[PDB]
């Protein structure tokens, strides 16, 4: 796909920080409801780190008032303002799928800070 990857870097964003798959980061999402931008800061833990060049992706799980909210924020998108890390956490793998279940006190064992 060598004749594709040249066009990709020109649209790619480098302003991201690098991050482990299992951690907590904060993200700022530019929202355009009407005319005023309600720039909100969504923070929490991350699960997926499935690649894709242009289409590198991640997921954000955040518990909200008794229920978690899966966030599929796109890495390569101008609607992202800034990604700011919080917890460099010891996670055994790159797929934290099982914390869609043990949602309670299992976020500590997986967030051994480093």
């Amino acid at each position: 796909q060598k004749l594709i990857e040249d066009i990709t870097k020109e649209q790619l964003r480098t302003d991201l920080p690098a991050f482990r798959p299992g951690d907590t980061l904060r993200v700022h999402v530019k929202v355009v409801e009407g005319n005023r931008e309600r720039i909100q800061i969504f923070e929490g833990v991350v699960i997926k780190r499935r690649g894709g060049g242009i289409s590198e992706t991640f997921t954000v799980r955040k518990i909200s008032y008794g229920v978690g909210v899966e966030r599929t924020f796109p890495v390569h998108t101008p609607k992202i303002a800034k990604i700011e890390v919080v917890r460099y956490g010891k996670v055994r793998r790159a797929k934290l799928y099982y914390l869609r279940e043990l949602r309670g006190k299992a976020a500590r064992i997986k967030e051994i800070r480093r």
Partner: protein, 206 residues
């Protein structure tokens, strides 16, 4: 009514000045070179013989060797025409690239489908399944041919055959971005064709 035709490579995403994660196609073809002008008074109608992906003398042939000296171009492959183009700006030897297309212009694609091989009735003709339990062994089979009194089968009743290898038109598609240096057209949506196969990119027939 214009048109280039070229190989495809892959599938990408391009978002431009919005959140629009648009699926894009990888249509990259070289500057097409008009081979031979069909005129109406000589050959019934007007057309443009077009060429693409020119090879070398290993696959050349004294028939196709003289096929290009009128146009003075290397012997290429996939020689097709375009029944709809103008008979003014398309002389014998003229070279056409991607500089013809720009942003916000309806296009048309006719391309060779994927060959899925000899499938069944289900994935070829959209046939649903029978019941998988409750005694009935019957499923994955195209049902009765129909009535009795005809003592025959209606030609047109569906049956598992080999599906693929024919053209598919898709109309009403758009261009998001052009890049002349790598000679790339970018199409919003998805376009029929497996990788390394030719794609006629014609103007979206309004």
């Amino acid at each position: 009514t214009k048109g280039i035709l070229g190989r495809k490579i892959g599938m990408t995403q391009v978002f431009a000045e919005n959140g629009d994660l648009i699926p894009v196609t990888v249509i990259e073809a070289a500057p097409n070179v008009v081979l031979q002008k069909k005129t109406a008074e000589n050959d019934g109608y007007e057309a443009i013989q077009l060429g693409f992906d020119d090879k070398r003398e290993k696959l050349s042939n004294k028939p196709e060797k003289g096929h290009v000296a009128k146009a003075e171009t290397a012997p290429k492959r996939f020689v097709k025409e375009l029944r709809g183009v103008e008979m003014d700006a398309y002389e014998v030897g003229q070279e056409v690239k991607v500089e013809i297309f720009s942003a916000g212009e309806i296009v048309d694609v006719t391309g060779v489908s994927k060959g899925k091989g000899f499938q069944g009735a289900i994935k070829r003709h959209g046939q649903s399944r029978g019941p998988m339990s409750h005694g009935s062994r019957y499923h994955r089979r195209p049902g009765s041919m129909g009535p009795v009194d005809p003592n025959r089968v209606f030609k047109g009743k569906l049956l598992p055959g080999r599906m693929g290898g024919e053209q598919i038109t898709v109309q009403n598609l758009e261009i998001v971005k052009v890049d002349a240096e790598r000679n790339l057209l970018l199409i919003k949506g998805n376009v029929p064709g497996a990788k390394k196969s030719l794609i006629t990119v014609k103007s979206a027939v309004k």
